[PDB]
């Protein structure tokens, strides 16, 4: 299987990338350096992760060392919810560019479909704990994203955590100039996303699977939640293939024509996670993994559920 997938902007995107949410700032520079050394060419970033400066130090050092050329890297970031406004989008993108020490992004995503009140706080709340919305809509935010392409700041634009109706809304936007290249969504054997993936793929939108290992380090994890990495059924498939459970969990989305972005700051795991291009899951393995769906989401947040554009009320 090829290492890159063709996007609807004509560029190629590496199907394996390194995730950076929760990567501590004192560890992420080395994580990214190691990743690039062992073959990663795609890094998934976001302003809200608060570590783009440190990710950027690594990228810049590897460019300076001439380990890789800029054209060989595929750097992704995301517009946070408090920047949905027309007058804030460019500056948000530019802050990310400055922190990452880049002149352009390969892909810039609307991080969540919901706009929040601008200000210093990433999750502005009212006194009762509800997020404070902005009156911005996804269509006007999309127009602002299109401007970034036309100014040369980003090569591609896309969306993240958009449900099927929201993707459709963008595709049906009056005067749409650029289709979204990517929808980045949670996807793993406990949240298999068959409906949304089929819709997006049918429209030529590439899907990126986040939290492919079930995000065991998510800060809201409870001791009782299901655990992909410990699931004996998945362990059995891994054992049959002489691979680790994580390697199976990474190969799974790859064979569905998805991009996948496992996170690690452990050098041995960063390397392990990349060694997924030399084995194949059978069709029976794939269907078996799909059968584990339980509609379980890592990524959801009670404080945001009443926002008009919160994505997880719809079935898909
Ligand atoms: N667009 C969005 O809204 C959104 C939401 C969530 C995530 N994402 C992106 O997707 C990325 C991945 O998702 P995620 O960070 O939620 O979780 P994940 O990649 O599913 O899991 C990361 C966890 O798995 C551990 N791990 C990694 N490789 C392992 C291996 N080979 N064996 C055992 N454990 C391993 C990591 O530990 P160590 O790091 O300690 O090694 C870390 O605790 C994020 O970092 C972010 O870039 C985007
Ligand atoms: O959104 C992500 O990429 C990962 O999740 C988070 C990352 C940070 Cl740095 C801070 C908060 C979250 C989080 O709570 N995500 C869940 C969520 C769900 C719906 C909306 Br709208 C916003 C966040």
UniProtKB/Swiss-Prot annotation:
Residues where N-acetylalanine occurs?
2
What Gene Ontology cellular component terms go with this record? cytosol; extracellular exosome; extracellular space; mitochondrion; nucleoplasm
Q: How is its activity regulated?
A: Cys-299 may regulate the kinetic and inhibition properties of the enzyme, but does not participate in catalysis. Tolrestat inhibits retinal reduction.
Question: Which sequence positions carry the modification called Phosphoserine?
Answer: 3
Does the keyword section mention Phosphoprotein?
yes
Effect of substituting residue 44 to N: Reduced glyceraldehyde oxidoreductase activity
The record, for PROSITE patterns, names: ALDOKETO_REDUCTASE_1 (PS00798), ALDOKETO_REDUCTASE_2 (PS00062), ALDOKETO_REDUCTASE_3 (PS00063)
Q: In the record, what terms sit under GO molecular function? A: aldose reductase (NADPH) activity; all-trans-retinol dehydrogenase (NADP+) activity; allyl-alcohol dehydrogenase activity; electron transfer activity; glyceraldehyde oxidoreductase activity; glycerol dehydrogenase (NADP+) activity; L-glucuronate reductase activity; prostaglandin H2 endoperoxidase reductase activity
List the residues marked with site Lowers pKa of active site Tyr: 78
Catalysis performed (reactions): an alditol + NADP(+) = an aldose + NADPH + H(+); all-trans-retinol + NADP(+) = all-trans-retinal + NADPH + H(+); 9-cis-retinol + NADP(+) = 9-cis-retinal + NADPH + H(+); 13-cis-retinol + NADP(+) = 13-cis-retinal + NADPH + H(+)
- Which residues are recorded as binding substrate? 111
- Is Cytoplasm a UniProt keyword of this protein? yes
Q: Which InterPro entries match?
A: AKR (IPR020471), Aldo/ket_reductase_CS (IPR018170), NADP_OxRdtase_dom (IPR023210), NADP_OxRdtase_dom_sf (IPR036812)
Location in the cell reads: Cytoplasm
Q: Which residues carry this modification: N6-acetyllysine?
A: 95, 222, 263
Predominant subcellular localization, coarse grouping: cytoplasm
The residues that hold NADP(+) are 10-19, 211-273
Q: Which family does it belong to?
A: Belongs to the aldo/keto reductase family.
Spell out the protein name for this chain: Aldo-keto reductase family 1 member B1
Provenance organism: Homo sapiens
